[PDB]
Design a protein around this ligand. Structure first.
Ligand SMILES: [Ca+2]
Lengths: 46, 223
């Protein structure tokens, strides 16, 4: 998982490889660097 | 909302959706022109959507009103999420009828064990992801202060209350931020944060509304 104490806001962000996160806090939680703000297509395969 | 059920149409008439392109947080209508939400949901441009049930389909009961005033609690701490409350004044009053109504502020704080109703359009999964079209509802009890503090050592302030289950399974989640927690017809909490969603021994943490009744009142009267 790699779950952390994060606010419950939905503000998707894009990361490494192609996975998008619910919000930035969740991203930094895992490790994945915020490549850009918003979800992401062929930068993930779901 | 993880482990909830689809709310009955207009069973939660005070629920609003904060939109800035897409739904990002929930909120509550406290009077015809004021909305209460979480301070971390703060954005300089916000469109409030009222009378929503299915957020992906125009059903004919909706009111889309832009926010005029957006005021975060003076002591909001972005790092600890203490004083996570925000007031939005609509640019035009909302029209009250069957699908749009106001929720009442609490006279005092809820006692532990009190059953409340939580709602929102947030994630319905704790491991994967699934966002619903329809508003989700969940009944959960306000937990004791000792239980809340043992669940989140050194992280609970006097402006936070835990609501949910220590057994996990049911909880609010991402996309529910700022939404209402109503007990006995009174707004007692605002969806704030937690360790993931629906995790064992990690119930959701909510802004304790009863501590802000005076601030809310002073702000509305002065604006
Ligand atoms: Ca709709």
């Amino acid at each position: 998982k790699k779950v952390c104490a994060c606010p419950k806001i939905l503000k998707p962000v894009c990361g490494s490889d192609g996975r998008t996160y619910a919000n930035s806090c969740i991203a930094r939680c895992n490790g994945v660097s915020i490549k850009s703000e918003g979800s992401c297509p062929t930068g993930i395969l779901n | 909302i993880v482990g909830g059920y689809t709310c009955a149409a207009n069973s939660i008439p005070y629920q609003v959706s904060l939109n800035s392109g897409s739904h990002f947080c929930g909120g509550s209508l406290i009077n015809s022109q004021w909305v209460v939400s979480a301070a971390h949901c703060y954005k300089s441009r916000i469109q409030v959507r009222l009378g929503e049930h299915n957020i992906d389909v125009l059903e004919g009961n909706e009111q889309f009103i832009n926010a005029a005033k957006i005021i975060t609690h003076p002591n909001f701490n972005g790092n600890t999420l203490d004083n996570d409350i925000m007031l939005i004044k609509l640019s035009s009053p909302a029209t009250l009828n069957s699908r749009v109504a106001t929720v009442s502020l609490p006279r005092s704080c809820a006692a532990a064990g009190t059953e409340c109703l939580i709602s929102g359009w947030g994630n319905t999964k704790s491991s994967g992801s699934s966002y619903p079209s329809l508003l989700q509802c969940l009944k959960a009890p306000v937990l004791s202060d000792s239980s809340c503090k043992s669940s989140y050592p050194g992280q609970i302030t006097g402006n936070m209350i835990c609501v949910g289950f220590l057994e996990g399974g049911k909880d609010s989640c991402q996309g529910d931020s700022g939404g209402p927690v109503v007990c006995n017809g009174q707004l007692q909490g605002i969806v704030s944060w937690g360790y993931g969603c629906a995790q064992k021994n990690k119930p959701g943490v909510y802004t304790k509304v009863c501590n802000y009744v005076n601030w809310i009142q002073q702000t509305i009267a002065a604006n």
